[PDB]
Amino acid sequence: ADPDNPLVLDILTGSSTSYSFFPDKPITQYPHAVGKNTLLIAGLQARNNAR
Amino acid sequence: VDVDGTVEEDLGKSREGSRTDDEVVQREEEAIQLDGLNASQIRELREKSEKFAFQAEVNRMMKLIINSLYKNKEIFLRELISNASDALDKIRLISLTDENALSGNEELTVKIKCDKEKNLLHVTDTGVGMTREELVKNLGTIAFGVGFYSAFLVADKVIVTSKHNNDTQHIWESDSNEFSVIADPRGNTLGRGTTITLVLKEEASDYLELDTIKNLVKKYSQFINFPIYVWS
Amino acid sequence: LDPSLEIYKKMFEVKRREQLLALKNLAQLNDIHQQYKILDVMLKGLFKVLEDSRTVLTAADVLPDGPFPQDEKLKDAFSHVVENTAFFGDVVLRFPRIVHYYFDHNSNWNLLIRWGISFCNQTGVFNQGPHSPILSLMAQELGISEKDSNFQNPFKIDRTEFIPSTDPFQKALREEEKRRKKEEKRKEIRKGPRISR
Amino acid sequence: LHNQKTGQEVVFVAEPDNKNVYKFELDTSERKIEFDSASGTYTLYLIIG
Amino acid sequence: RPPGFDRVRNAEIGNKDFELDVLEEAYTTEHWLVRIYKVKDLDNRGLSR
Amino acid sequence: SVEDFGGNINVETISAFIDGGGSVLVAASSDIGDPLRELGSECGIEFDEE
């Protein structure tokens, strides 16, 4: 979820150990998502109330 | 173009009340500034530089159009020497492919001799040179060729002695009415290159002057790569 | 024609080299506002000089299709009429709109040039060499002579063109630019461990 | 590094050196951005998998 | 004079092409003497404008 | 897995649809095509690489 956007809803976060990366390739770089930052399901509430 | 309608000037805007000053820039742009340079002054300065240069463009065009070039054909020396440098350049290019190109005269120089008494100007170059057939074809029938032929503007008659690598030295002489080409009596005196003896007109006596020819060389041929020699 | 006149053909073409060299020089200039100002001086100086040159030839009464202009007074006028008109054709072709605004309006200028164009067309000067087409092209451009079906002034383009209502290429430019903006945002988030909402 | 009071978690990636011995260093001044300069006690964990 | 010239300042504008992220053109007079722009609202999706 | 939507459906069109008040549900996978990632970008949710 982008921090800048307040409307983002972190419905379901990943585990503390979970991370997102290419399984085959070694983790040279910092993970795109690490720990609880990783989101499995997220929701949005628009200003017009669209969901 | 998009719309029409140009406003007029409000000669008496000042009386208007409760309105903001629409001239701050103008007034402030001329206020005497002690220990500082006035804004207006710097502006004027650059304006002079840019504007002055622009005027020079008009100057140049004025001359080109308003002139008579051939009437004031002091450029004839430029044309003559420019050919001499060109021919030296051509032979230099030929020399790289063929050693024999420079065999007649390895040294590439221009020698100028002024004969005021005889109304003759001799310009000698060690360039590519010209054959007998080329003398009749290129010189016997004209045509740009202006570089050599500018001489006639100040000269009644032109005498050319040309020796090319492929042919023996031959002399082409024309008075602008008829031309004759004969084998050079002296033989390959040049080895290779062309020496032009110019039968100047009465009006061209000033060109015969040693100072005048040198001034023309500086004026037009100063940038020639090959050294230029003036008789002294 | 006259042998000296044949020499003049070389003389006229020689001037053309300087005239074209300057013509390129004027192109180097960018501002149109300066460009018209000098160009207007080109027309006023050239046409006024042309008016004297035609008067000089008129007093001479030398046929255009005739012996080389010999007397210096007429001969320089012959240089001015042919050489200046040839440059005038280059100026007209390179700068069609500018000349037409400053030239078509004046009847005297059109008539004076028309006398010159016929005067050149009878001399035969624009019959040989690479500048012979210039006489035909300029007359067509000015409407003195019928325009050829394939005759198009390369310079006479409509720089105004048409409003770029169709800008799908620019829409792609917008996308890519905003896309780079979007890529940097993600890269920023990467860094290392941030705090958790 | 888990902040005991807030519950915040900060994850860093350890990398081996030439000798295959992993080295990790914490510099507070530089790492302010990662932690947001949030001071406090952090439990330290090693995750290997 | 070339396009985009400003007659009263007698100078040509340096920046000719730009877009208004937060403003939209509502009405302009025939001679452009008065220009009215409308304030755009916030982003429906919450994206930074 | 679909790289592109059929007919007139486009990321812009879906964005307009959400602005109209329609509700949208998106399901992703490891085979995610570019349009789904772009749609998340407009909504502020950043999908990982394929």
From Swiss-Prot, chain A:
Subcellular location: Endoplasmic reticulum membrane
Assembly with partners or alone: Component of the oligosaccharyltransferase (OST) complex. OST exists in two different complex forms which contain common core subunits RPN1, RPN2, OST48, OST4, DAD1 and TMEM258, either STT3A or STT3B as catalytic subunits, and form-specific accessory subunits. STT3A complex assembly occurs through the formation of 3 subcomplexes. Subcomplex 1 contains RPN1 and TMEM258, subcomplex 2 contains the STT3A-specific subunits STT3A, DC2/OSTC, and KCP2 as well as the core subunit OST4, and subcomplex 3 contains RPN2, DAD1, and OST48.
Family: Belongs to the DDOST 48 kDa subunit family.
Implicated disorder: Congenital disorder of glycosylation 1R: A form of congenital disorder of glycosylation, a multisystem disorder caused by a defect in glycoprotein biosynthesis and characterized by under-glycosylated serum glycoproteins. Congenital disorders of glycosylation result in a wide variety of clinical features, such as defects in the nervous system development, psychomotor retardation, dysmorphic features, hypotonia, coagulation disorders, and immunodeficiency.
Protein name from the UniProt record: Dolichyl-diphosphooligosaccharide--protein glycosyltransferase 48 kDa subunit
Species per Swiss-Prot/TrEMBL record: Homo sapiens (Human)
Full protein segment contained here: 204 to 254 of 456
Curated annotation (Swiss-Prot), chain C:
Locus of motif Prevents secretion from ER: 121
Listed GO CC annotations: cytosol; endoplasmic reticulum lumen; extracellular region; intracellular membrane-bounded organelle; membrane; nucleus
Post-translational note: O-glycosylated, with additional sialic acid modifications.
Predominant place of localization: endoplasmic reticulum
Residues that carry a glycan: 121
Subcellular localization: Endoplasmic reticulum lumen; Secreted; Cytoplasm; Nucleus
Residue span of motif Nuclear localization signal: 179-186
Keywords attached to this entry: Coiled coil, Cytoplasm, Endoplasmic reticulum, Glycoprotein, Nucleus, Osteogenesis imperfecta, Secreted, Signal
Entries under Pfam families matching the protein: ERK-JNK_inhib
Tissue expression profile of the protein: Expressed in cervical gland, cervical squamous epithelium, endometrium, stomach, kidney distal convoluted tubule, spermatogenic cells in testis, mammary gland, liver and striated muscle (at protein level). Also detected in placenta. Highest expression in testis relative to other tissues. Detected in T cells and dendritic cells; highly expressed in activated CD8(+) T cells, and also expressed at lower levels in CD4(+) T cells.
A GO molecular-function descriptor: protein-macromolecule adaptor activity
Region Disordered: start-end pairs: 166-197
InterPro entries tied to this protein: Coiled-coil_dom_con_pro_134
Self-association state and partner proteins as the record states: Interacts with TADA2A. Associates with the PCAF complex via TADA2A binding.
Similarity comment: Belongs to the CCDC134 family.
Record-given protein name: Coiled-coil domain-containing protein 134
Organism: Homo sapiens
Gene: CCDC134
Curated annotation (Swiss-Prot), chain D:
Protein name: Dolichyl-diphosphooligosaccharide--protein glycosyltransferase subunit 2
Location relative to the cell: Endoplasmic reticulum; Endoplasmic reticulum membrane
Whole sequence portion shown: 438 to 486 of 631
Lineage: Eukaryota, Metazoa, Chordata, Craniata, Vertebrata
Source organism of this protein record: Homo sapiens
Family as reported in the entry's similarity comment: Belongs to the SWP1 family.
Summary of the tissues where the protein is detected: Expressed in all tissues tested.
Function, in words: Subunit of the oligosaccharyl transferase (OST) complex that catalyzes the initial transfer of a defined glycan (Glc(3)Man(9)GlcNAc(2) in eukaryotes) from the lipid carrier dolichol-pyrophosphate to an asparagine residue within an Asn-X-Ser/Thr consensus motif in nascent polypeptide chains, the first step in protein N-glycosylation. N-glycosylation occurs cotranslationally and the complex associates with the Sec61 complex at the channel-forming translocon complex that mediates protein translocation across the endoplasmic reticulum (ER). All subunits are required for a maximal enzyme activity.
Coiled coil residues, start to end: none
From Swiss-Prot, chain E:
Localization, UniProt: Endoplasmic reticulum; Endoplasmic reticulum membrane
Tissue: Expressed at high levels in placenta, liver, muscle and pancreas, and at very low levels in brain, lung and kidney. Expressed in skin fibroblasts (at protein level).
Source taxon at top rank: Eukaryota
Record: disease: Congenital disorder of glycosylation 1W, autosomal recessive: A form of congenital disorder of glycosylation, a multisystem disorder caused by a defect in glycoprotein biosynthesis and characterized by under-glycosylated serum glycoproteins. Congenital disorders of glycosylation result in a wide variety of clinical features, such as defects in the nervous system development, psychomotor retardation, dysmorphic features, hypotonia, coagulation disorders, and immunodeficiency.
Family: Belongs to the STT3 family.
UniProt protein name: Dolichyl-diphosphooligosaccharide--protein glycosyltransferase subunit STT3A
Gene: STT3A
